[PDB]
Design a protein around this ligand. Structure first.
Ligand code: AXL
Length: 515
């Protein structure tokens, strides 16, 4: 054809992502992509070697590429150069060489918030994290332009633009970059000090359902598009499931207190520190107890104690609490590839499965689910929907644990942290803090039993105890030093991060004299 009217795409500006206070976290940056029409290049061959050198290409390999693409009318030279580098090639004035203005993401906080903010692909589309989850909101709509193409791929004139490029929309996350940096720094330090393989830390606002911080190790710099390490790009807090172990005992206890059959001052006989159930043996770490009260069962973390309570009240009541607080349940966050985990269910619960459920084996949850469950407990038993975006109007929560039961369990968890023989490393000077340690043996990758030397160290809690504001989970995978108990490995991280986060949020210190 002598003339040919066709259409080309004009890239649109991707929406700005900020933290909850407007600090930029993902910013669309103008880049210059160079393309060429090989047929037009065929008329200026003496210019090719200088063009090749400017592109850092070998002269022969470049010439070979153009010659073998002589039939085509569109060939990429280089994508995503800075407009500074792009003009240096444009300045050669080579016939048939053209530029289009595209966009590439810059991430000002880099590795500090990489998992939460996420990453974009070669075409500026979200492929991880918020970038992926809110891709429709962020992407906008590209422009569509008219053209006039010949048999040589030549363009004549303009006088067009049928469709204008629509920019994407701004998005403010629930994340507070101040708390995010604190959490990042403390988790990294903990990983290194313990020679651990991986870790996750989530901070949630118990009143609004907002995720205030979400950090994992290992992490990566999303501005380095060359490294491409899949393991480091995993948002473990949302995609890696684990047995939460003794961190679910406060939920078993909630079921016990709701049953009508148990009060905190009631007693369980846990002597001699083991309990046989068919071919399975329930075992406590500390085996020098006889009568323990319900608070003591949580302080000492007696598997025997919680198991006997579970046999009394029935597994159904415990399953119900865990399901209602969201363990093994869809979070509704809508991140593709987010893992839901699994909460086992039965019509007739056998005794072994009843016991293991009560102390957190045989179910799999994510760190986000665990933090959300603790948020409901801290928020006087009311569960506010999870959000990764800033919440200005809070949706109504669902009452999942009665307020009196939740309050009672809160006081028990304060004792876990403060009482003699408790998790003293979770204490937060100036405040009352509450929570529960866990230590879980990892199930072998093959068939293959439980891995003898591989543990996960957990601490989950909230503060300030007298008026809860923040819930936090710290999960550290395979610590390598002498300590591996959650109370040794994860509790000090909870303490350090809570100390900073409460003060960054201007929460009044509550360890005061009696009124
Ligand atoms: C819950 O997390 C419980 N953990 C275990 O019973 C676990 N199978 C285990 C026992 C012994 C080990 O050396 C390692 C793992 C109890 N709660 C824990 C906690 O951290 O609070 C323990 C006190 C380790 S036991």
């Amino acid at each position: 054809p002598a003339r040919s009217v066709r259409h080309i795409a004009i890239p649109a500006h991707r929406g700005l992502i900020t933290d909850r206070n407007g600090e930029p976290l993902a910013v669309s940056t103008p880049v210059t992509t160079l393309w060429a029409n090989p047929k037009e290049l065929m008329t200026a061959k003496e210019r090719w070697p200088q063009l090749a050198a400017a592109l850092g290409q070998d002269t022969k390999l470049f010439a070979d590429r153009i010659e073998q693409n002589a039939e085509r009318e569109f060939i990429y030279l280089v994508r995503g150069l800075t407009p500074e580098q792009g003009e240096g090639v444009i300045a050669l004035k080579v016939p048939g060489v053209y530029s289009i203005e595209e966009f590439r993401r810059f991430y000002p906080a880099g590795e500090v918030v990489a998992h939460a903010v996420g990453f974009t692909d070669v075409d500026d589309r979200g492929r991880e994290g918020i970038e992926l989850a809110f891709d429709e909101w962020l992407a906008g709509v590209p422009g569509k332009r008219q053209v006039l193409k010949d048999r040589r791929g030549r363009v004549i004139k303009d006088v067009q633009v049928t469709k204008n490029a629509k920019p994407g929309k701004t998005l403010a996350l629930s994340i507070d970059l101040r708390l995010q940096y604190l959490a990042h720094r403390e988790l990294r330090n903990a990983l290194l000090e313990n020679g651990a393989k991986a870790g996750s830390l989530v901070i949630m606002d118990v009143k609004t359902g907002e995720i205030l911080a979400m950090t994992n190790q290992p992490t990566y710099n999303p501005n380095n598009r060359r490294n491409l390490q899949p393991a480091a790009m995993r948002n473990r807090a949302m995609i890696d499931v684990f047995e939460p172990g003794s961190t679910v005992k406060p939920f078993s206890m909630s079921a016990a207190l709701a049953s009508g059959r148990w009060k905190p001052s009631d007693i369980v006989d846990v002597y001699p520190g083991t309990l046989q159930i068919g071919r399975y043996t329930i075992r406590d770490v500390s085996r020098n107890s006889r009568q323990l009260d319900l608070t003591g069962i949580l302080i000492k973390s007696s598997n025997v104690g919680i198991s006997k309570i579970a046999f009394d009240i029935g597994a159904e009541s415990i399953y119900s609490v865990m399901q209602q607080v969201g363990l093994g349940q869809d979070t509704g966050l809508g991140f593709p590839g987010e893992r839901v985990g699994n909460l086992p269910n039965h019509r007739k619960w056998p005794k072994a499965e009843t016991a293991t459920l009560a102390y957190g084996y045989g179910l799999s949850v994510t760190a986000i689910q665990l933090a959300h469950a603790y948020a409901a407990l801290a928020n006087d038993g009311k569960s506010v929907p999870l959000s990764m975006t800033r919440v200005d109007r809070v949706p109504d929560g669902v009452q999942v644990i009665s307020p009196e039961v939740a309050s009672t369990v809160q006081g028990m968890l304060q004792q876990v942290v403060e009482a003699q023989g408790g998790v003293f490393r979770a204490q937060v000077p100036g405040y009352h803090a509450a929570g529960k340690s866990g230590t879980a043996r990892k199930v072998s990758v093959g068939t293959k039993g439980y891995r003898e030397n591989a543990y996960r160290s957990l601490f989950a809690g909230f503060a300030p105890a007298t008026d809860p504001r923040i819930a936090m989970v710290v999960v550290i995978d395979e610590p390598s030093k002498a300590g591996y108990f959650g109370g040794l490995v994860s509790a000090p991280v909870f303490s350090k991060v809570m100390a900073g986060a409460l003060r960054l949020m201007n929460v009044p210190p509550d360890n005061l004299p009696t009124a």
